[PDB]
Amino acid sequence: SEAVKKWVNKIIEENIIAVFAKTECPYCIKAISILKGYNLNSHMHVENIEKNPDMANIQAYLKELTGKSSVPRIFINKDVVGGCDDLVKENDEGKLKERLQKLGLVN
């Protein structure tokens, strides 16, 4: 489905912070909360891929793009961050704040 790919791509391109998630997902919630802690809301979009008829195609494409089909899947300016553990590593090690500084999202 070129349509599935185009829809996912549009989500990743039109939003600097893009998070694919699902219903009742503790690590989705944690990742999203961490990102909102940097006051990124205005440039963040969260898509619930579970409430979607094409979840399997979406997940397969996210795997093609990032290496894993699990949620959360996190992109920042089209760059793959990965999952919540990846985000936590970047945050703890200073990489996340660096990313956001380069994009003018934090001072």
At the fourth CATH level, which superfamily is domain 1-107?
Glutaredoxin (3.40.30.10)
**For 49-94, where are the E strands, in sequence order?**
73-76, 79-82
Q: Which amino acid is at 25?
A: C
Q: What is the largest CA-CA distance in the chain?
A: 41
Residue 47 in marked binding region: yes
Residue 50 in marked binding region: yes
Residue 45 in marked binding region: yes
Assess contact for 61 and 34: CB atoms under 8 A: no
Q: Which amino acid is at 27?
A: Y
Describe the crossing of helices 84-92 and 95-102 by its angle, rounded to 10 degrees: 90
Domain range list for the chain: 1-107
